Structure formats: C-alpha cells, structure tokens
Amino acid sequence: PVVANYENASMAADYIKRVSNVLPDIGIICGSGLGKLIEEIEERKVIPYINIPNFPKTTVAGHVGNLVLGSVGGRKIVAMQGRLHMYEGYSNQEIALPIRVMKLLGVRVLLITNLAGGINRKLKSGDFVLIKGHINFPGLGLNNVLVGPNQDEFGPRFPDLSNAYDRLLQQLALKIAQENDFQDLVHEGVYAFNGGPTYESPDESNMLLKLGCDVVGMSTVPEVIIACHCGIKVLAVSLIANNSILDAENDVSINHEKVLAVAEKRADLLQMWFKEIITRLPLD
Amino acid sequence: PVVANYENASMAADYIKRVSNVLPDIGIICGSGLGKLIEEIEERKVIPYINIPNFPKTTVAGHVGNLVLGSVGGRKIVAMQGRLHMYEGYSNQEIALPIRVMKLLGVRVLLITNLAGGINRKLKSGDFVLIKGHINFPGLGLNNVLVGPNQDEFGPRFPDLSNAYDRLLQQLALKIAQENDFQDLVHEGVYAFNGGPTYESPDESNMLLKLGCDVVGMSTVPEVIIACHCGIKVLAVSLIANNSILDAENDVSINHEKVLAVAEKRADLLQMWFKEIITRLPLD
Amino acid sequence: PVVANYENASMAADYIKRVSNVLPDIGIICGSGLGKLIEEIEERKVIPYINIPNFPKTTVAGHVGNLVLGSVGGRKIVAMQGRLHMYEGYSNQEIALPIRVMKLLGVRVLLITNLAGGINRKLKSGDFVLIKGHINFPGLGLNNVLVGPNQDEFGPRFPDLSNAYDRLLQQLALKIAQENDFQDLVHEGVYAFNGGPTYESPDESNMLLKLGCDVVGMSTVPEVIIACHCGIKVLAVSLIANNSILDAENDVSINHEKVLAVAEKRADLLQMWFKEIITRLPLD
C-alpha cells in the first residue's frame, strides 16, 4: 500500500540518482497545458513513473507519467511530467511520496503552476496570480494531505503554514514581470482549494467571494503542504481561465476546452517567465 | 468492489430490461415519508436491488430496497424504493451506479424530493423549495461523489454545474402549483449539503445563513451531480421540516419524528403535484 | 476491522469491569500537557489499551495508551491516558468505541479539555473557553464521526446537537472559577473543528473570524458527537495557546512547543478546577 515514509522515498531516490546522474536543486510541477518548459530541459533524462520503485500507479487515469531531470537556465532541475491530482482518487501517501523524493534528491525550491477560476472582480481570463495564502476546504474537513501517521524524518506533526508561500520568491517573480513589461497581468491573492472535479457552482463562487477568496482551483495546496512540511520553499502561480463571478452573473458555463485555450494563449510567456526566475534564483 | 463503470452499469440495465419490459423516460427518487407516488405505478414491476447484478448491497442498513418500473400519468418511469444516502457509508461508486443504470435504461429527466431544514427566514414547516443551486460542502472538501477515475462513457472529467437544476422544470413545477392554488407554499432557493447524519448545529445554521444558504439537508446533491455528469435533467424539491434559525433562537430541537410528521402532512399534495408534472413533461 | 457496535463494546467493558473492579460515573479525556489530574487518581487501576479486547491499535503513532480507573474528589472515574485524534488517521469506528465502552461502564458525564487557537479578539494565551457550540467542518464535509451504519443500541440515526454542551455544567464550571477568583480567565465561545494536522492558515483564521467562530482546534468535536449520540452529558473546555488573528496580523508563527508551554503554565490550575467540578457534580 506504499506509505510515503523515509525508507520508501529513499529507495525511489536511489534509483533516480543512479539512472539520471543529475542532482537537482529545483523542482517543477506544471498546470495542464503549461508543460512547455520541460521541452527546454537540456541534457535531459526521462524516467517513467512506472520504472521508479514505490512511485504511485497511474495507469487507471493513464496519459503521460515521467520524471524529467536536466538543466534549465544554468540550474539542475527535476520535473513531474504528468501530475497527480487528488480528485482522481490518489491517496495522501501517493501525493506525498514524489515530493518527499524531490526532498531526498536535494530539491530546495518548488515551482508550481495551475489553472484556476477568478473570484476577485479585478481578475480577467489570462491573468496570473501569485498565491500568497490559501483556504484549504479539504484540510478543514479531515481530508488534509497530512492526515495519517507523521513521518518524523521529513517534518513535524503540526506544521505552521504562515510561510508556506515564500515572500522573496513572490517578489522575484513580480520583479521579472516588471522588467519584461507584463506586470499588468500579475496579481497576488488567496487561493481556495475546491477538491473537485466539478467546477465551483455559481453559488459556491458567490460564497467564496464573501469569504475573501481571490481564486479557486482543484490543485496545488496538497503539494504546497507536503513541501512546507519537509522544508522546501514554494512559489505557486495560478493562470486565470475565467472569472467565475462574472460568469455566474451572465449565466455562462466553464469548460475544460476553454480552460486549455487560455493555457495555450499564455504557455510561452509563462515558460519565459519561469526560465528567468530559475536563472535568478539564489545559489543557496 | 464494483466500480460504477460502463460495463457494470450495462449488466444491471440488461437484467432490468429483460425482467420488466419497461423502457422508462423518467426517474424518481423520493424523500423519506414521500413515497406514495410509487403506489400509483400502473402495470408495475418490482425488482429487489439484491436481484440486480452489480447493485449496491444494502443489508447492513436494511429496510426496503426495490427498483419499481411502470406507468405514471401516461409516462414510463423508474423509481428507487429505498434510497442510498452517503451518511450511511455508501461509496461514490455505490451512489453513482443506480443513476447511471437509469441513464442506460433511457431516463432523460430525474425528479427528486427530500426533507430539509429552513435557513431563510421566509421558510416555514410544510413549505416546498424548488432548488435552484447548491453549496456542496463535501465537494469542496474532497468528498465529491465524482472523486475517482472518470467514466468517460457517461460524461466529462470536469462538469460545470451552472445548469444542474433545469430552469424549465422549475418553471413548470411553479405553474402547476399556481393552477392548483398552493403557490403560496412554493419558494425557490439555494441548498446546502451537510454530509450528516447529525442535524446542523445551531451555530452551523447561523453560519449557513451568513453564507447565503436558504435550505440545508443531507441528501440529493450527490444524485444531482451524477445525473448532470451523464446529461440527465433534474428537478429537485425540498420539503421544509422546520426553520433551523428560529429553532436555534428558541432553543427548540429537531428530531426525525417531527420530520416524518411533516412528510405525512404534505405527502398526498406532493404526490398530486408530481403526477401532474409527469403528465405535463415534454415528450422530448 | 472492529466496528464500534454493541457486542464489541460489551466485550471490552466486560474485561475492564473484571480487571478494575471500578464502576465509573464520570469519564475524562485530556488535552496534550493537561494530564496531571490522572496523577490524583486514588485507588488507581491502569489498563493498557493493547490488553483490552477490541480497543484500537495505537502502536503506529506510539506513546502512552492506558485506560485509568479510580477515585477523584470522592467520585469514581475512568480516564483515557493517550488520546486518539482523527488527524492520526483513526477511523470513525476507532474513535467511537472507547466512548461507547465508557457508556457501558456507566459513565453519565464526560469532561474534556483541549488546546486551541483564539479567533475572537477578546482571547489571550492562557485563557480558558467553555465551549457552548461548534462549527464542524468535517461533519459538513461527509467526514462526520457518525458516518456509517447506525448502532441503534447506543442512539438514533439523526442526533440533534443543540444540547451537546450541557448548560448546567458550563454554569457550574464558571461558578467554581468565580469562587476561586480566576473568572477573568474564563470565557464562553463557539469552537471550529479544523481536521488538521496543519494549524489554521492565516487566511483560514480570517475566514473563521468572519463566520462567527471564537476558537479553532483539531479535536474534541468527534468525542462530543459520540457522547451526545449515546446520552452522555459533556463539559468541554479549550485552553487558548495563542490568538491566531493577532499572530496573522503580526506575522508570528504557531508551533507545538509554544502550545505545550502554555499547557504547562495552566496545567495545575486546570487540575484544581476539574477536581472541584467533579466534587460538585450531582450524584444523579
């Protein structure tokens, strides 16, 4: 049933270290349609999940499932190609293990993107939101990704999340957007985690507006919590597919096809942005 | 462990088709104490769940468990006699399969009733509420009925719920209430799904009032989401057992005995109402 | 998989009755660092959980796990030394069984303490809060401790929680605080149940403030609901470790070390308080 413990994560890391010969400092997890950066991986090594000891089985959902290692912007990185989402039914242990493997591989910074709905009236389709905090409905409701025995080797029983979204990384991301004159697309905000897989209902959207949420999505918070637990710094950026409040007012529906079209519209800019961020990251 | 997939649903539908010789266009799921309509089933065929391949086992909870087919108001219908509720511990797969069997049987419209608590100050015991939207706390909290692999043959990975409660069906229900001069009992509103089985606490009721909820109950939203996913139109009506906000202000308790007494008070009127709705439904 | 049913609870109670020769009227469950009262147990009998038929296995988490019986303040009591929390991954059945064993042993009143975060601006580190109601996010989200088959021998399918926190017991606790001149430390309030194990995020804290929550913690509500279901009266007291709203405004982190330091600061006073409450409890 593979628990995301020290022994099991170590066995996966040992396999990866041997096969790739890359020691990554940075990890990357991408939103759907936002995977182009993994094409710029120089000296790349592709490792199917299915080959890695103790990695989660992903064949029921299918589609791509690779760990990709190599160099971006002069830095060594490890990327997940084929993301695990909790609405697919993956367990807490299955979500946690690949991030803890990143930790054992030497990852100190995790960069994450996702697609999400805009709740704040200021947000438009195609905007970026630097996530500065979250409202974790699964966590409040006994489905926190850390429910279960604590793995002491990685972190504490009761983590504090007040610094889960690194302030310096947010400031660096904004700086680079300003230098390249697309800062008008960049916002900061609070992310509500909707477990999914149904989109927020119109009345759910309205409730989230009342509760001080700026953005809503079905991902990212579980990964953030596992990273924070084991001391990995996180930058999380949402690409806004739509404004759910406006759509509710106008009786307009959300669909994944529209979402992917927005991802295609911004994928190249997001790639350029994150490549520069990687280049500008501290060597420490 | 029977997954609610295409193959398993097909095997159940094939058994039912053979035994009943009825091709239903309408499905019906009833609230507790609101099952009288299933007595007007003409040319009826009763099929115990326990006889149907792949139907959920319900013997731990016990009580009645039949699929009933036949004719109401000149239309062919299929009804669940003995409802599956998620607070009993049924899985996502167990809730989903009977609705997907309805889909394969040919159901295009699902009519659902339930008993619920009033939050909106305008609501009194014995009132009806046409549900026009919902706040799905289990869904926000990673217990959405669709969590797990998607069954592509039935619907999309990410459904939009903005039209989950059919507007035309709401308007028809209200029209019939007006013709029979009981429209003063009929409201529209937003339904909060409390997983249950404890009634909303007084402070939970107060919170729901702040969040724009009109009614709260422990059912119906899972069925609505499975129906919406596979393209079945839904009319959902709550019978109000009590006003939870007033009861909290007056330190008055809710109990199931009082709830069933309200169901008995309105069961015959609800039967007449729904029979007329069935008669007036489009042939398409 | 041991269900918390009548037969299984009876087997545990029969073992305990034989080994201890104590018939307790009062049960006690303590917050972390607040276990000193279990040192004043006169004529004490210590029974490891691992020896009791059908008790939950707790070796993965480890640490102490004893049932302690004996006399406090002239009354016969049973205490849990080593508390089961749902964020550890224990099931509904594992949480419920020890409280139902208390019921079969003859417990009529359950006294519970916990450590929690202050949301209400009036609350300071070291304050006590008499819990008068709750917001149960796991319950709203389909993780209520009673989800599953109902055990009819203990209580009803649909409990009402409006009297879950006994008013007379709250008044008695306050009276004793007044007599001993520490009533300035004592508040009353509404408790939000955060499943855990991560502390409330700063934005979650802000949301809880908007929703009328006074205190937030990761315990106690499951035990309250099982006790209420089987007719045991409850007094629940939170010791405030910090004010989460102030900490968010000042960018100050919460950690368990700080929490335990507050418990140490108030443990002796809480012991004296609860011993007096036990002495003053009705003989009925």
Numbering used by the authors:
A (entry chain A), B (entry chain A), C (entry chain A): 4 to 287
According to the publication:
Structural information of SmPNP2 in both the apo form and in complexes with cytidine, cytosine, ribose-1-phosphate, adenine, hypoxanthine, and tubercidin was obtained. SmPNP2 was readily crystallized in several conditions, ranging from pH 4.0 to pH 9.0, in cubic space group P213 with one monomer per asymmetric unit. The main difference between the SmPNP1 and SmPNP2 structures is the presence of α-helix formed by residues 247–252 in the latter, at the beginning of the gate loop (residues 244–260). The presence of an Ala118Leu substitution results in conformational changes of the phosphate loop centered on the Ser35 residue. The presence of a bulkier leucine group in place of alanine next to the Ser35 residue in SmPNP2 blocks the movement necessary to assume a closed conformation due to steric hindrance maintaining this loop permanently in an open conformation. The presence of a new α-helix formed by residues 247–252 and the substitution Ala118Leu also appear to have a large impact in the active site and gate loop conformations. This can be seen by calculating the RMSD of Cαs of residues 244–247, which display a values 2.84 Å, thus indicating a considerable deviation from the structure of SmPNP1.
Purine nucleoside phosphorylase (PNP) (E.C 2.4.2.1) is an enzyme responsible for reversible phosphorolysis of purine nucleosides, generating ribose-1-phosphate and their corresponding bases. Here, we characterize a newly identified isoform of S. mansoni PNP (SmPNP2) employing a combination of methodologies: ligand discovery by thermofluorescence, kinetic assays, high-performance liquid chromatography (HPLC) and X-ray crystallography. The crystal structure reveals this property appears to be related to the substitutions in the active site that induce the locking of the gate loop.
